[PDB]
Amino acid sequence: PSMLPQWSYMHIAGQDASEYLSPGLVQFAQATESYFNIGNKFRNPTVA
């Protein structure tokens, strides 16, 4: 709560995992998605 709002620290109302992850990590996950599937380890808000 000191540096970020709670809905942003816990990815409840923030940005996509394609926008708050490191670009290198995004590229690594999309490159190794076929056999290691990092994708389900990160959460994205999906607000209404």
């Binding site: 996509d16 926008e19 999906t46 607000v47």
Partner: peptide, 16 residues
Amino acid sequence: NYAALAPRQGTHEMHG
């Protein structure tokens, strides 16, 4: 802009 209404992620049927 109609993006406010869209949820924030972050008809050719005729035969007999």
